[PDB]
């Protein structure tokens, strides 16, 4: 059989708040000079020292809107040259931002614990963004809707490409909250909910591209607690599926590895 | 100190993992391109790294010779003086899964001769639920890998107050690591150890620098983590906030971007 498809999940490299811990969500934050470094060899390893990717697999690159995860993207794909890049589609998807924080924007962990306290709130146990979301920023359940169908989108487009008997690795270069939420739900953490409200069955118009199919979801998936997941900035997770069948999506525990060939 | 790590490695090819037969117990060697495959695999991570030799405290292995194969495999592109410096210990805990019925079956056959027994009925046979005919049973295995990993925490959490970085690897098999590694972050369920051999001390390694530890509880899954781990492949297993109360799966496997 042609290769199982992978999706290729890429943390945007380091900006003056991921380095501090500060909540970076709408906030449009540049990466630093070394965060654009660190991307640059990061792309030369995937491609060129360790050829963990191949330009030919590739199909289409997700992207947040946000500044940081579009100069990833260019950075990454600078090994390649402008033919093999004319190959490969990229799709910007409001469905990939990061989580919205709300109050909690550039923030610190213990600060918005300190904040939710000065306002009567976890009282019986401690604030939970997975389980609790955010105060003036987005649920659990919205995050997880939104990333349920980009998650769709990519599995129907990986459908099309085994079909035809094309490999086909997606890349989805995003952030630290959304992508670990991604990677949960990709292989069946949390629960399962029937859309039915306004806002689950709505098309939000996240992305602009008509090579790439809406996907009306049924159903989503959203989590309810920590999926105890670690993604360094410019970290790449793997995400693909067992059996060279799509209805059984899996996490890769190798992320990017492979035992070099011969 | 670094966070401290556990690193999963599964032994590279032998003639039933390229076919897909179920090897638990068989003593397979690693096949010529196996060798090889480890080889490279060593060569990879150390040489062209994403693993730092003097940081390596143990290495815990599965007693089958295609695990000891790999680990000596893996381990080429060190010295003499820096292997003198790592423990390897052989655990049965770690061993794979026992397939009973099943061992140097494909899946399929598997199915199959469960049909032919009256089984499954009602809904499809699943390993990480049901375990296997005349095999282990999925607390059987849970609970043996729960030792093994209370052990190797410990060894964590007594390196880092050490101020000590400690990769610890552990080389086993496809069942048996993914399961590890499922277990590890959260996934299944706690039991009570109450049972004989849920309390017991089963004596699977002599190596007395490791302390045993007694547990009270173990965890165990019920169904499948959905999870990929090719032969050769390498996982990891680590902690949040530099804390070992709080482990985590690392998503990269072994990747890391190249320092400046």
Redesign the interface.
């Known amino acids: 059989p042609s290769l199982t498809p992978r999706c290729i999940?890429v943390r945007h490299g380091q900006t003056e708040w991921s380095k501090s811990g500060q909540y970076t969500g709408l906030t449009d934050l540049p990466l630093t000079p070394?965060g654009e470094?660190?991307?640059l060899?990061?792309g030369?390893?995937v491609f060129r020292?360790?050829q963990?990717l191949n330009p030919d697999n590739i199909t289409y690159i997700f992207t947040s809107p946000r500044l940081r995860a579009r100069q990833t993207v260019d950075l990454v794909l600078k090994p390649l040259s402008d033919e093999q890049r004319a190959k490969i589609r990229v799709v910007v998807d409001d469905d990939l931002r990061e989580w919205e924080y709300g109050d909690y924007e550039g923030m610190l962990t213990r600060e918005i614990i300190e904040l939710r306290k000065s306002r009567g709130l976890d009282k019986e146990r401690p604030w939970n963004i997975w389980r609790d979301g955010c105060e003036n920023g987005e649920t659990t359940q919205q995050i997880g809707l939104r990333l349920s169908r980009a998650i769709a989108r990519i599995q129907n487009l990986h459908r099309k490409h085994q079909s035809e008997g094309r490999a086909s690795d997606i890349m989805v270069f995003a952030h630290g909250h959304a992508?670990?939420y991604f990677?949960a739900i990709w292989?069946?953490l949390g629960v399962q909910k029937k859309c039915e409200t306004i806002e689950e069955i709505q098309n939000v118009k996240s992305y602009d591209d008509d090579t790439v199919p809406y996907v009306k979801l049924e159903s989503y998936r959203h989590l309810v607690d920590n999926?105890?997941?670690?993604?360094?900035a410019?970290?790449?997770?793997?995400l693909?599926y067992?059996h060279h069948n799509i209805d059984?999506?899996?996490?890769?525990?190798?992320?990017?590895?492979?035992?070099?060939?011969?």
Do not use: H, K, W
Request: aromatic content about 12%; glycine content about 14%.
């Open positions: 999940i070394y470094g660190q991307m060899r990061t030369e390893s020292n360790n963990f992508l670990r990677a292989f069946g999926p105890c997941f670690l993604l360094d410019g970290g790449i997770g793997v693909s067992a059984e999506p899996a996490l890769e525990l190798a992320g990017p590895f492979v035992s070099p060939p011969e």
